[PDB]
Amino acid sequence: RFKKHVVQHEETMQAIAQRYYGDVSYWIDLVEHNNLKYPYLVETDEEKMKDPERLASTGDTLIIPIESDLTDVSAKEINSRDKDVLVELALGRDLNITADEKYFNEHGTSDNILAFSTNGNGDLDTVKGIDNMKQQLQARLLTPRGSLMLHPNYGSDLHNLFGLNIPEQATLIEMEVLRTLTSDNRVKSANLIDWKIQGNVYSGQFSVEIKS
Amino acid sequence: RFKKHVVQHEETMQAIAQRYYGDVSYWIDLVEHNNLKYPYLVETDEEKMKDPERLASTGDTLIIPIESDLTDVSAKEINSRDKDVLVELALGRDLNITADEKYFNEHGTSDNILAFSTNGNGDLDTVKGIDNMKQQLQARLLTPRGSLMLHPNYGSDLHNLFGLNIPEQATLIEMEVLRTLTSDNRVKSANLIDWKIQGNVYSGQFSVEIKS
Amino acid sequence: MRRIRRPKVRIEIVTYNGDEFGAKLLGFQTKNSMEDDSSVFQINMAGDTYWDKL
Amino acid sequence: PQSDGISNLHRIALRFPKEGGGYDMYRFKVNPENYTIDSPQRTTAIKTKSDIVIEDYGKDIEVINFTGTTGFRPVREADGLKTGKQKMEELQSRVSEYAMQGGSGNVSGSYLQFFNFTDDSYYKVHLAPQGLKITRSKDEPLLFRYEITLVVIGSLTEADRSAVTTEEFGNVKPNASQRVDEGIKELDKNARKTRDRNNQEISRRENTIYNPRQSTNGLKGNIDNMALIIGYGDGGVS
Amino acid sequence: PQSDGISNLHRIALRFPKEGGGYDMYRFKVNPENYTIDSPQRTTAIKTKSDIVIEDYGKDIEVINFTGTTGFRPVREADGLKTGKQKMEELQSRVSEYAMQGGSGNVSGSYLQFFNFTDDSYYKVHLAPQGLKITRSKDEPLLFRYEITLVVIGSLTEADRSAVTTEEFGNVKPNASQRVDEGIKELDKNARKTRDRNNQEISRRENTIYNPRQSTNGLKGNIDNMALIIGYGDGGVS
């Protein structure tokens, strides 16, 4: 993992290293991680035109690796190869199956719902980044707990909770939803924000602390 | 022991194995218990007509041995061919002595009542399955405790419990009947469902949780 | 002022994951002495998992 | 039962074992002042660095404790007219009979049946380590108070451990081993010596509910009799 | 929500695990009279000869304990008409069933789920060693009383620690090790002996999560796969 950073007005790289690591002397590893020449930070943006890849200006994004992976040469190389797109390695890339969100929401828990799709031309569609995490969470929530043919205890028992609109049923649904979301290690935790029960259909929303 | 199961519509053997044994990999050995060819489950009825003995379809009864007996080759060999005979062998076989079912109820705690009978042709009648269990339980209840010439402490004190039809005597009779029914290790437990005393006749009923 | 201490023990194992092993730690002893010709340590583990088979 | 709605409640009763067969019982004329039932659990929780471990080892002993007294006025009995003092004395005598000659001599009954008609519950109980406790206070010139603690052996519905019958399908006695042992007893010294030598020879080059139906447990038992009677060597093998 | 005047009071309800799967939603018709919650800490203090040392290890196991009485008058139920005595007997039966079935160290299924609707909070709990203590004294003859103590495992919002789905990127079950083992098993005894000899010779000459992409941990797996498809000696290496 890492921490995003934005260069302040004529900010100093050594000050950044001291702030994010305590010891000032670790700045030599950070610039190697970012793969920057000696002009690490320049106030003038026009100077970046000469060597945009190897020169950072004010407002330029920077990567702050964790303390453990500071001196790892492999981590340095991988971070240099994936500057500003390092989040994709953790969350990953997967095939996109949410072809149309306007259609499958109404059906809910049932079979013959999702399907692959193609974006652009030729290349099969693949969802990456935060959208991939959201798609995985939605698929996990929609699927039953014991439906798939392998690694059971994957899914949720939401379909069994339809019934009376009494408050205890709502709290049970809330607990089940929180249990389903917390099952993935990529989510630190989750908690409710607001709940609403009007008519005969339950409504609610949740927030999840997505890493990075 | 083995749990009975019925083939569900559009169901696969892998899901059947995963639901009970948890890991789908056990299905390779589970098929040998049922003695089925490669078409383990087929919806088409006429397909089974070619060889009904070595095939199964929707609505048929399967065998689900416990994990301990799953790996035993002897259990596989016995369950391959016996099929429905397993329940009769599991509950045992014994000679039937309910020659006069109408008569033995009229004389409780009386000797020289039960006798052999004849069914089929030229052979003494026999009982098997749940009927054998019920016959054995009835004989144990009718048999007094300390009358048998060998393996004593078999029976009940029902003859001695006649009294003033008061509630405490009724509870004592209930406990005696429960102890008599629960003596056999095959039966799990028992409990009274209804009590009714009017005049000078005691009436009631009990439920027994028989294994399998 | 009185010092504040927050111990946090970590265990690594090389031939089950080491992190899972270190989670169930309860206590340990480490007898090292130059007087004798042997150094010995002991580790106490919880009964959550069957370590005998692992 | 209780006094609300349903008919008049039945008093608590105790059943004790009669020495000369049968049973004798004891019904309290006055309901207990206090009734406490403890049902603890044998489970311990210990926390590791970043997790909580919970372990359990079954249900604990259900301790029954209650306190009561005896009314001074008389009341009808099954035989005779016994007042509260006589009832309490009989209770003490029964408890002494169950306790004093429990560890010494012999007592026919292995347990006591505790009936709670008011609470609609039944248990098999034994005298607790605290035991019976009798006292008369300043404000009881004529009344007598009794305090008793009990430990539940188990549910009264279930049968006794010694009076349990297993499945016992098929023959239970391996008659083959019995007749093998009977035949071996008649063998001479040389035959037994040769049998031992053959067993040693087979032993040193190995690695390189009796029912014949639906089982294979009693395989080598039948072979031993057949080998002995026919003769595989002077004495036999296995 | 409590009886704050805006919303009606919501009574505490339990949720035990059923033997045949699912859960049974047990609800109290009267809130507990007393409610106590403890949050002990694992902090320890040791006095050195010249200064005090304060050391902490984190949050300890919490304890939940409460006491109350069941209602007297009959009250309707969602699937019947159960009185207070029936409710208490059902609670005792459920507790006994949950305690007895945990004879295998710990039940593989979910723990007891506690739902406190009086104040917004949820917990996963287990039976404390104190257990379900039931008593009924002379005062209030027709009202039962129950005392329950519990230990908190964790918040119901979070799932089980061991059931969390890790990243599992790449391949945790590499085929290289499997086919290397298969090839080594298929090799002759002399081939394995020569492989051991080569490994010993290489050891003498020392001196004097898996992913094919962007990872080096699986380097040995690719190399160990080789030296068998190509006869790098009479057997593999490493």
Side-chain angles (χ1 to χ4, degrees):
Chain A
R1 298 180 63 180
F2 67 99
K3 299 174 68 59
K4 185 176 177 180
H5 182 68
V6 291
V7 170
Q8 221 185 356
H9 171 52
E10 62 172 8
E11 192 172 8
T12 301
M13 188 63 66
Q14 286 76 358
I16 293 163
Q18 187 178 235
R19 191 186 299 179
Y20 280 89
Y21 301 127
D23 298 359
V24 71
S25 181
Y26 300 159
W27 70 275
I28 64 187
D29 299 330
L30 181 59
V31 303
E32 186 175 357
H33 272 278
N34 294 272
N35 187 22
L36 307 178
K37 293 173 183 297
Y38 155 76
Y40 308 111
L41 299 171
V42 61
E43 187 176 1
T44 300
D45 301 331
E46 282 70 1
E47 301 295 345
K48 186 171 180 179
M49 189 175 182
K50 296 181 288 189
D51 301 325
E53 186 63 17
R54 309 295 295 280
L55 177 51
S57 63
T58 56
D60 188 8
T61 55
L62 294 171
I63 307 304
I64 307 303
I66 65 191
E67 187 175 1
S68 181
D69 303 329
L70 184 64
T71 58
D72 199 332
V73 301
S74 60
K76 291 172 182 178
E77 184 62 18
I78 294 296
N79 296 324
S80 299
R81 288 177 180 180
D82 298 355
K83 291 171 67 174
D84 200 6
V85 72
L86 181 54
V87 182
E88 303 297 344
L89 305 184
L91 282 68
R93 302 186 182 84
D94 195 356
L95 300 173
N96 180 22
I97 54 173
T98 55
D100 289 317
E101 287 75 352
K102 198 75 175 182
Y103 167 77
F104 90 105
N105 293 329
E106 297 293 349
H107 292 63
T109 56
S110 287
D111 65 330
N112 192 40
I113 308 304
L114 306 179
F116 295 102
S117 179
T118 304
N119 184 89
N121 182 90
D123 299 1
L124 183 59
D125 193 1
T126 164
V127 68
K128 65 195 79 175
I130 309 308
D131 300 329
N132 177 85
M133 191 67 259
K134 291 186 175 181
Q135 183 175 289
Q136 289 288 359
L137 291 171
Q138 193 175 26
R140 192 181 190 84
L141 191 146
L142 291 167
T143 311
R145 184 172 249 88
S147 60
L148 191 55
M149 308 301 295
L150 278 167
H151 52 72
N153 197 21
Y154 148 75
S156 60
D157 302 0
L158 184 62
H159 63 274
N160 303 285
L161 302 174
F162 304 147
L164 303 175
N165 65 333
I166 60 183
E168 58 177 6
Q169 196 71 1
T171 62
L172 289 164
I173 291 163
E174 185 187 357
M175 292 296 101
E176 190 67 11
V177 170
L178 292 172
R179 292 269 292 284
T180 303
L181 297 170
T182 53
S183 180
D184 198 331
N185 185 25
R186 291 170 289 186
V187 175
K188 297 175 71 175
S189 59
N191 53 335
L192 183 137
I193 303 301
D194 189 5
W195 66 289
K196 184 177 179 179
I197 294 166
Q198 298 295 346
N200 52 16
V201 185
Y202 178 82
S203 179
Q205 59 189 133
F206 295 90
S207 298
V208 287
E209 295 290 353
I210 293 162
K211 299 178 181 178
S212 73
Chain B
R1 293 175 61 268
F2 54 93
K3 298 178 72 61
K4 188 177 180 182
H5 182 53
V6 292
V7 175
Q8 197 171 8
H9 172 47
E10 59 172 3
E11 188 178 18
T12 57
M13 196 69 173
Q14 282 72 355
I16 294 164
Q18 189 176 231
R19 190 184 291 91
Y20 292 95
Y21 304 150
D23 298 0
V24 75
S25 181
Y26 287 100
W27 89 279
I28 63 188
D29 301 329
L30 182 58
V31 303
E32 189 175 359
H33 288 276
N34 299 269
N35 196 338
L36 303 174
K37 289 179 174 293
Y38 162 78
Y40 305 107
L41 279 65
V42 61
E43 185 177 353
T44 309
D45 299 329
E46 57 175 2
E47 188 66 12
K48 182 172 177 179
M49 192 67 178
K50 190 177 184 299
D51 44 323
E53 176 55 25
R54 302 294 300 279
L55 289 173
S57 64
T58 302
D60 298 333
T61 54
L62 300 177
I63 307 302
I64 304 297
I66 65 191
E67 283 72 357
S68 181
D69 299 328
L70 177 56
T71 58
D72 199 330
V73 301
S74 61
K76 294 171 185 182
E77 177 56 23
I78 293 286
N79 298 335
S80 294
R81 193 173 290 94
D82 289 64
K83 295 284 284 185
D84 186 70
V85 184
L86 300 171
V87 169
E88 306 300 341
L89 298 170
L91 276 63
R93 302 174 182 175
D94 193 359
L95 304 176
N96 184 16
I97 55 174
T98 60
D100 301 330
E101 190 175 2
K102 189 70 173 182
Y103 178 77
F104 87 105
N105 304 281
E106 299 294 347
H107 298 69
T109 68
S110 301
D111 300 329
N112 305 269
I113 302 299
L114 302 174
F116 300 101
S117 180
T118 300
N119 271 255
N121 184 19
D123 187 8
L124 278 65
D125 188 9
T126 168
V127 68
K128 55 177 72 175
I130 296 287
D131 300 330
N132 180 26
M133 172 51 66
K134 291 184 176 179
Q135 182 176 307
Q136 287 183 353
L137 290 171
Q138 195 70 3
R140 200 198 194 89
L141 188 140
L142 295 171
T143 299
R145 201 189 202 84
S147 61
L148 302 192
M149 312 61 182
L150 297 78
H151 52 71
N153 201 332
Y154 188 97
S156 63
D157 303 1
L158 185 61
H159 62 273
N160 190 23
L161 288 166
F162 303 148
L164 307 177
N165 70 87
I166 54 175
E168 59 184 8
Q169 195 69 30
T171 58
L172 289 166
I173 293 161
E174 185 190 346
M175 293 292 151
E176 187 66 14
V177 169
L178 289 164
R179 286 195 299 274
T180 309
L181 293 169
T182 54
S183 179
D184 198 331
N185 188 23
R186 287 173 288 182
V187 186
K188 295 175 70 174
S189 62
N191 57 271
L192 178 135
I193 296 285
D194 186 9
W195 63 272
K196 187 175 181 180
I197 294 164
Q198 298 297 343
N200 53 12
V201 189
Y202 181 85
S203 180
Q205 56 182 359
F206 299 90
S207 300
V208 295
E209 297 292 349
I210 293 164
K211 294 182 178 181
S212 70
Chain C
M1 186 174 175
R2 275 61 173 278
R3 292 169 290 185
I4 193 72
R5 193 175 289 277
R6 296 179 178 277
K8 187 177 181 181
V9 175
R10 194 206 307 175
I11 291 160
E12 186 177 3
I13 193 180
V14 68
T15 60
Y16 52 91
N17 187 272
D19 190 7
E20 299 180 0
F21 179 83
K24 307 298 185 180
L25 184 65
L26 186 64
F28 57 91
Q29 305 177 22
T30 298
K31 170 167 170 58
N32 181 21
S33 54
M34 184 173 173
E35 187 177 356
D36 65 333
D37 303 330
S38 179
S39 176
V40 67
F41 68 99
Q42 179 169 318
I43 294 164
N44 300 336
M45 301 297 295
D48 189 8
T49 57
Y50 308 92
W51 294 111
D52 189 11
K53 302 188 291 186
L54 273 62
Chain D
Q2 296 184 347
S3 300
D4 60 331
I6 198 164
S7 62
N8 299 332
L9 79 181
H10 187 280
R11 278 68 172 180
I12 291 163
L14 276 164
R15 198 180 190 81
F16 299 93
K18 186 177 285 185
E19 188 177 3
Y23 295 93
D24 191 359
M25 65 197 304
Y26 177 90
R27 57 182 65 82
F28 294 89
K29 301 294 183 173
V30 170
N31 298 273
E33 184 175 0
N34 302 330
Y35 186 12
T36 57
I37 316 189
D38 304 333
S39 183
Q41 228 295 340
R42 300 293 299 184
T43 184
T44 305
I46 43 169
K47 195 187 177 185
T48 181
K49 191 180 75 176
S50 303
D51 197 352
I52 292 159
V53 176
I54 304 301
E55 56 185 8
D56 198 334
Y57 298 131
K59 190 181 177 183
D60 202 349
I61 295 164
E62 187 175 1
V63 170
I64 292 163
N65 176 25
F66 57 94
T67 298
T69 186
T70 58
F72 167 73
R73 283 283 180 180
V75 69
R76 285 263 59 84
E77 294 283 13
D79 187 7
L81 182 63
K82 296 180 176 61
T83 191
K85 192 191 78 175
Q86 295 188 0
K87 204 76 172 180
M88 213 287 291
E89 189 178 2
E90 289 290 354
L91 181 58
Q92 288 187 133
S93 179
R94 295 282 170 79
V95 170
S96 176
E97 185 177 357
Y98 183 81
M100 294 187 70
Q101 57 174 6
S104 180
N106 179 25
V107 170
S108 60
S110 301
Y111 51 88
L112 300 176
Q113 307 181 17
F114 186 60
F115 298 84
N116 298 90
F117 299 93
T118 305
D119 303 71
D120 302 327
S121 191
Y122 308 89
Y123 301 102
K124 289 182 287 186
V125 306
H126 188 62
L127 291 172
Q130 285 74 355
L132 183 62
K133 179 171 179 295
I134 307 304
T135 161
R136 183 169 62 268
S137 180
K138 176 171 170 62
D139 303 329
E140 299 178 12
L142 309 177
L143 305 177
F144 298 90
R145 168 158 277 97
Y146 50 89
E147 303 180 2
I148 191 175
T149 307
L150 302 171
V151 281
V152 170
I153 293 162
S155 181
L156 183 61
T157 63
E158 301 297 343
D160 302 330
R161 190 76 70 80
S162 60
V164 72
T165 302
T166 191
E167 299 181 0
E168 202 175 358
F169 288 117
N171 196 317
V172 71
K173 195 75 175 181
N175 183 263
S177 180
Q178 186 176 359
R179 61 175 169 271
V180 167
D181 188 9
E182 190 67 11
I184 290 159
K185 201 76 76 177
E186 194 171 5
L187 294 173
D188 304 330
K189 196 192 300 307
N190 302 123
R192 294 192 299 276
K193 218 76 176 182
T194 304
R195 182 175 176 81
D196 189 8
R197 191 182 294 92
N198 296 17
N199 294 17
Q200 284 185 334
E201 171 51 32
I202 297 297
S203 188
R204 65 192 178 189
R205 297 195 298 176
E206 293 181 358
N207 197 329
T208 299
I209 317 190
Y210 169 73
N211 194 336
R213 304 182 187 280
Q214 63 171 1
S215 287
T216 62
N217 58 335
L219 173 51
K220 291 287 182 64
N222 302 120
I223 300 299
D224 298 327
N225 176 80
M226 180 164 57
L228 176 57
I229 191 70
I230 300 300
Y232 197 87
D234 302 329
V237 283
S238 71
Chain E
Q2 67 190 134
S3 178
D4 62 348
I6 293 163
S7 179
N8 64 88
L9 180 59
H10 197 167
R11 307 187 180 79
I12 293 164
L14 304 177
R15 185 180 184 83
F16 296 90
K18 190 175 285 186
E19 187 174 2
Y23 310 91
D24 186 8
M25 188 66 179
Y26 180 87
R27 56 181 66 84
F28 289 100
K29 266 284 178 180
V30 178
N31 290 17
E33 208 72 357
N34 299 332
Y35 200 166
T36 63
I37 316 189
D38 297 0
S39 301
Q41 194 70 5
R42 300 189 296 179
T43 296
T44 309
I46 54 182
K47 192 263 168 67
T48 60
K49 66 189 292 185
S50 299
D51 193 358
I52 292 282
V53 177
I54 308 304
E55 53 185 345
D56 187 8
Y57 293 89
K59 166 262 196 176
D60 207 332
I61 293 160
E62 295 178 358
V63 189
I64 292 164
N65 194 337
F66 58 93
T67 301
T69 169
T70 57
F72 171 76
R73 277 281 183 173
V75 69
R76 296 204 69 78
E77 191 62 286
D79 199 354
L81 174 56
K82 304 178 77 66
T83 191
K85 186 170 68 60
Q86 287 183 358
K87 202 76 169 182
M88 197 276 290
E89 288 175 3
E90 186 63 17
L91 179 58
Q92 287 192 89
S93 179
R94 292 284 179 180
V95 168
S96 180
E97 185 174 0
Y98 184 80
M100 290 174 65
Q101 62 87 8
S104 60
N106 181 21
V107 71
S108 180
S110 300
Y111 310 94
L112 305 179
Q113 300 185 10
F114 194 94
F115 296 88
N116 185 17
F117 303 134
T118 304
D119 52 323
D120 300 70
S121 184
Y122 306 90
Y123 297 109
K124 298 188 291 187
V125 305
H126 192 69
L127 301 174
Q130 284 73 356
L132 182 68
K133 178 170 177 294
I134 304 302
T135 169
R136 192 173 71 270
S137 181
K138 185 172 181 179
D139 301 331
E140 307 182 358
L142 306 178
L143 291 169
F144 305 94
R145 181 170 287 95
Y146 59 94
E147 300 178 0
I148 293 162
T149 308
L150 300 169
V151 299
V152 187
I153 291 163
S155 178
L156 180 54
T157 62
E158 299 294 346
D160 301 330
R161 194 76 65 178
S162 60
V164 71
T165 297
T166 190
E167 297 183 359
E168 202 174 1
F169 271 59
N171 184 15
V172 72
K173 193 77 173 183
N175 187 256
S177 179
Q178 298 295 334
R179 66 179 173 274
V180 168
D181 181 70
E182 189 66 13
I184 291 162
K185 197 76 76 177
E186 188 173 0
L187 280 172
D188 201 332
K189 299 184 289 298
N190 301 118
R192 297 197 302 178
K193 193 71 173 180
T194 302
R195 159 164 158 81
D196 187 10
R197 194 209 307 174
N198 298 328
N199 298 330
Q200 289 179 4
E201 190 67 11
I202 292 283
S203 182
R204 177 256 183 273
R205 197 55 174 77
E206 288 288 359
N207 183 20
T208 309
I209 294 163
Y210 159 72
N211 191 319
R213 299 173 179 275
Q214 63 169 8
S215 297
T216 316
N217 56 5
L219 175 52
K220 303 295 182 63
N222 300 119
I223 302 300
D224 290 3
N225 172 82
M226 304 188 75
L228 303 176
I229 308 308
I230 304 302
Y232 189 86
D234 184 71
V237 303
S238 71

